[PDB]
Design a protein around this ligand. Structure first.
Ligand SMILES: [Zn+2]
Ligand SMILES: [Zn+2]
Lengths: 80, 59, 62
């Protein structure tokens, strides 16, 4: 229901940066779109923004698994 | 026999059905660039028809 | 009509009868701006129907 505490595949602690990453991603996507209604922003268009350098700035390495699980995990607080 | 009373209505309607195959061939009667082609029966008779009333095999 | 007029020139004796023909054109009226408006919530299916850009087809009419 949250971003996992560690990467499911390797066990790197991606969850110590999960809150910062979620808030920073929200701010970054808003900057890239430029102040638009949440429903008027398509789900597809916001997922095409590159978050490579944001994750790099968090200090998370270039591992495929860790970035996959940090980027794709669904949040239960945003669906209920 | 076919082409006479078995499919007379269909053949007379074939130029106006928009789902029928066309052929790039000039019409002798009204000089139209395209014609309508049909292929009815187990002998696969090929009939060309036009909107103006032209028809192949002396129609 | 252009085919008929090209034929009228052709039979009468004009050696440039084929320059009266125009090309055939078929197209839909859906535009990229309409897709953009759909994704923005400003356009709907019942509004596309209202200006006759689409229509409903049953298996009978298909
Ligand atoms: Zn990992
Ligand atoms: Zn004709």
């Amino acid at each position: 229901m949250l971003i996992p505490v560690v990467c499911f595949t390797c066990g790197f602690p991606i969850g110590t940066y999960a809150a910062i990453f979620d808030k920073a991603r929200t701010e970054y996507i808003k900057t890239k779109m430029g102040g638009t209604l949440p429903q008027n922003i398509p789900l597809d268009a916001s997922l095409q923004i590159e978050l490579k350098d944001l994750i790099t700035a968090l200090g998370i390495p270039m591992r495929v698994c860790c970035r996959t699980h940090l980027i794709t995990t669904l949040d239960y607080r945003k669906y209920y | 026999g076919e082409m006479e009373d078995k499919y007379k209505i269909f053949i007379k309607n074939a130029p106006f059905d928009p789902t029928n195959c066309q052929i790039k061939k000039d019409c002798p009667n009204c000089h139209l660039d395209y014609l309508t082609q049909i292929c009815i029966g187990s002998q696969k008779i090929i009939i060309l028809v036009c909107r103006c009333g032209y028809m192949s095999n002396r129609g | 009509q252009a085919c008929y007029k090209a034929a009228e020139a052709r039979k009468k004796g004009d050696k440039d009868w084929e320059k009266h023909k125009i090309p055939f054109i078929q197209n839909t009226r859906f535009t990229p701006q309409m897709a953009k408006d759909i994704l923005a919530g400003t356009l709907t299916l019942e509004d596309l129907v209202a200006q006759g850009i689409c229509e409903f087809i049953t298996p009978e009419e298909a």
